[PDB]
Design a protein around this ligand. Structure first.
Ligand SMILES: Cc1cc2nc3c(=O)[nH]c(=O)nc-3n(C[C@H](O)[C@H](O)[C@H](O)COP(=O)(O)OP(=O)(O)OC[C@H]3O[C@@H](n4cnc5c(N)ncnc54)[C@H](O)[C@@H]3O)c2cc1C
Ligand SMILES: Cc1cc2nc3c(=O)[nH]c(=O)nc-3n(C[C@H](O)[C@H](O)[C@H](O)COP(=O)(O)OP(=O)(O)OC[C@H]3O[C@@H](n4cnc5c(N)ncnc54)[C@H](O)[C@@H]3O)c2cc1C
Ligand SMILES: NC(=O)c1ccc[n+]([C@@H]2O[C@H](COP(=O)([O-])OP(=O)(O)OC[C@H]3O[C@@H](n4cnc5c(N)ncnc54)[C@H](OP(=O)(O)O)[C@@H]3O)[C@@H](O)[C@H]2O)c1
Ligand SMILES: NC(=O)c1ccc[n+]([C@@H]2O[C@H](COP(=O)([O-])OP(=O)(O)OC[C@H]3O[C@@H](n4cnc5c(N)ncnc54)[C@H](OP(=O)(O)O)[C@@H]3O)[C@@H](O)[C@H]2O)c1
Ligand code: NA
Lengths: 315, 319
């Protein structure tokens, strides 16, 4: 039972929904596939303060529910599925889902990015039993208990700041001695450090995630300059070492650059066009530099307008 | 006041109070760049000349362009952006701090984000120039109230002309939509709404027509002479106001000879490796419709405004 769409959008983050809204207003009758994280990465943050025009109190989940209802306002067909294989070698394009299969005349890819892991066997062993990559999902378990966050970028800082309202102590662990985040969040971070609420463990790498048959009980860390080992007692570990683009299913199907989908870019339009004619990409899956909801939504709009111009040219 | 007190220095200066400029201010303020934003003469930008906006993602109920832009203003002020009411009439980008000269005061800055957008074009006729402010307008929300229950004309065939015709269709007695082709290029949902109004007779289509002259008396417009594009048959139309909606041109006259331009748009690096809003002058960035001749949406302008703030932060940090 192959479901055919004129325009198929993969992803229910801000790029996917913005593409759907524009495509629906162009009378393209878009079909949007949600994926397994409906709403996208913003559903794993708490307050969003830099969505322009939301100056009061907006949560990531609240914003993405608005975008869902916006796409539905213009009758976007929203389908739950997870695409596990694509074949772009001929048209119409073929996509293979956990629930059903699809074909389409134009494809907008907005599959975003997902958290990476450090790769230790002990880390794997405790995934979903005290090792997590989503602070808002699992933070409540650690009310008044010690937790760890590993990483030094804008995700690690946001997760440490979120957990600082919940945990007794947040141990923020990084293999360098400085952090990279919006400066307003660096300011908040160091205030919590001066209050003793966040404890910094700089120039440290994870050596082993420790625990028992229930869950995590601590970490062994290694000094990046001496090799010297140390142990830390804690109840949960949040791995925040970066989100890599969700493009495994496009290996061998599209031009990628370090996993990001290569698009035309440029100043002459058709800027979201991939290496395959009729396939476009928007949002974090093609952006390794800005990584914002607002920039993802902007390229989502561009992909819809690019896809409209392409379908118009097919007669 | 003296020449020294008229020179405000900003670490980062943003020109324009449309969605590109305000989004840049929000990000720049959160990057501790203490931004100063110069509003220009159209505070809030082009969206203050439209009524409802239906494609700002996440605004699914009833939002107007002016409502959204007032929100963005308050958002920039939340992070303590300094908002300055001025219009820049000249710049010198040859030295750092960059020098800008305003109608009200002068400025210097360590980095500059240009988000000056675009303004409505006029056809270029003497009769059209003669009746500006006397019945010739390029802003339907500004002036439409004065034509309640009177006939009006809109000229143009694109998204702006259709949206302005749809707006005036609720105010004028009749809207005459005039265009030099038989076809209109706008969002297909808007085209559907246009033809519902045409079929209701509230909008009357004048296809294959060009403006030959704008007619009036000592006090203001009284009609138009149109020319058939096919034959050349001239004809006259009685109406009280004309809204010219033939597109917008990027506001870059003050950057001529200062930045690389292409058909008046500011050329930026673009690309996929960051620093995408950098102009030909190091430390100067451009965002929004002033650099985008292809998409021209609020959401795309806001996205590039964010990029310009992040690029300017990376530039200032490196100094
Ligand atoms: C903790 C955290 C905090 C953040 N805070 C902010 C903030 O304050 N401000 C801000 O601007 N940005 C913030 N961001 C970044 C922002 O969330 C992203 O830039 C944005 O969500 C990117 O949107 P996107 O649509 O490109 O992708 P995503 O939001 O990642 O959405 C991808 C979508 O694709 C779907 N998908 C993935 N793989 C498949 C598949 N195989 N088949 C089908 N569907 C698939 C997913 O289910 C998801 O719905 C934050 C990110 C994180 C992780
Ligand atoms: C009638 C109409 C309807 C529209 N409807 C929609 C819609 O429904 N959805 C949508 O997404 N988009 C819509 N748009 C387009 C949208 O308004 C623009 O894409 C967007 O406003 C561009 O933002 P910007 O910040 O780049 O420029 P602008 O909004 O043009 O802002 C430019 C700013 O720069 C300032 N400025 C200019 N020159 C100077 C100077 N010399 N010194 C200082 N400041 C200066 C101006 O005062 C202004 O504040 C519409 C446009 C029009 C005209
Ligand atoms: O952000 P992003 O998605 O664009 O990617 P990213 O910047 O490469 O990663 C974000 C943060 O996580 C750290 N990190 C990445 N991989 C790591 C690992 N394997 N072990 C420990 N820390 C790691 C990075 O440190 P580095 O800056 O040291 O990579 C950086 O502070
Ligand atoms: O945005 P943008 O600036 O790129 O808008 P645009 O798409 O160039 O213009 C929008 C509409 O205005 C018409 N137009 C432009 N200049 C005109 C003129 N001098 N006289 C009469 N009609 C004119 C165009 O007609 P065409 O479709 O004939 O260009 C088009 O349908
Ligand atoms: Na409202």
């Amino acid at each position: 039972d192959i479901k055919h769409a004129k325009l198929l959008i993969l992803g229910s983050g801000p790029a996917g929904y913005t593409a759907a809204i524009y495509a629906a207003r162009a009378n393209l009758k878009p079909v949007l596939v949600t994926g397994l994280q409906q709403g996208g990465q913003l559903t794993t943050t708490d307050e969003i303060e830099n969505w322009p025009g939301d100056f009061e109190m907006t949560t990531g989940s609240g914003l993405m529910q608005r975008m869902l209802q916006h796409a539905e306002k213009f009758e976007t067909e929203i389908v739950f599925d997870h695409i596990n294989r694509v074949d772009l070698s001929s048209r119409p394009f073929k996509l293979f889902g956990d629930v059903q299969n699809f074909t389409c005349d134009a494809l907008i890819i907005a599959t975003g990015a997902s958290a990476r892991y450090i790769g230790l066997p002990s880390e794997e062993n405790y995934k979903g039993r005290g090792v997590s990559a989503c602070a808002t999902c699992d933070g409540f378990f650690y009310r008044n208990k010690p937790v760890g966050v590993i990483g030094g970028g804008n995700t690690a800082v946001e997760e440490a700041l979120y957990l600082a309202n919940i945990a007794s102590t947040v141990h923020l662990i990084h293999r360098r001695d400085s952090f990279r985040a919006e400066k307003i969040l660096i300011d908040r971070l160091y205030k919590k450090v001066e209050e003793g609420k966040i404890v910094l463990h700089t120039d440290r790498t994870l050596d082993e995630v420790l625990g028992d048959n229930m869950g995590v009980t601590g970490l062994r860390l290694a000094n990046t300059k001496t090799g010297e080992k140390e142990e830390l007692k804690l109840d949960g570990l949040f791995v925040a070492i970066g989100h890599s683009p969700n493009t495994e299913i496009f290996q061998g199907q599209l031009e990628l650059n370090n996993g990001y989908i290569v698009v035309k870019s440029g100043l002459d339009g058709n800027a979201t066009a991939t290496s395959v004619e009729g396939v476009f990409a928007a949002g974090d899956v093609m952006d390794h530099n800005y990584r914002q909801a607002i920039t993802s939504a902007g390229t989502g709009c561009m992909a819809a307008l690019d896809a409209e111009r392409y379908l118009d040219a097919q007669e």
